[PDB]
Amino acid sequence: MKFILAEKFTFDPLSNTLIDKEDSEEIIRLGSNESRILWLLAQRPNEVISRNDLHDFVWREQGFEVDDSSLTQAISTLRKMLKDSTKSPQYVKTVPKRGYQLIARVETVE
DNA sequence: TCTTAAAATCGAAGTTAATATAAACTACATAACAGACATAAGAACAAGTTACAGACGTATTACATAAGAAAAACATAA
């Protein structure tokens, strides 16, 4: 099932591709970790998910354990490549002591 | 001017506490006493208002600590 974010971006959890409607010619390439994080965020529309729970769901299924700086770096790359605002709540933000939040709308293509 | 009648005086204090006999009836107007009512003064209960106090609740100020991000240094592979 393909998902649409904020009526602008399109992404699929199965092939890890990003398409911007403003520039449909340029496909945006994302890493597996950040793509899985964004898909986990999209699976729970617009409510807080824990850093601990999201981290353990993303990386223990991978079979290997990493430190918590990895999640922060992955989110930094996600915000940078999506060209989301540096600290304003436009698409993805961080809620301290509670976890991570998404603002972009969810539109399932199929 | 020589009798002769009036007039006046006669110690202080202290004490010193009443008497005491002797026409009737009628008519009228006025004052006084008693009862009741209304009025001015008074008291009690409740309400409005205007303010100040008392402790609680708000905003100004100075931070402790922990999560997140940037950066410098290090180890490793080409």
From Swiss-Prot:
The gene is toxR. This transcription activator controls cholera toxin, pilus colonization factor and outer membrane protein expression in V.cholerae. It binds to the 5'-TTTTGAT-3' tandemly repeated DNA sequence in the cholera toxin promoter region. ToxS interacts with the C-terminal periplasmic domain of ToxR, stimulating its activity. It activates transcription at the promoters for tcpI and tcpA and this is presumably via ToxT. Residues 2-104 bind DNA. Signal peptide: none annotated. This is Cholera toxin transcriptional activator. It is found in: Cell membrane.
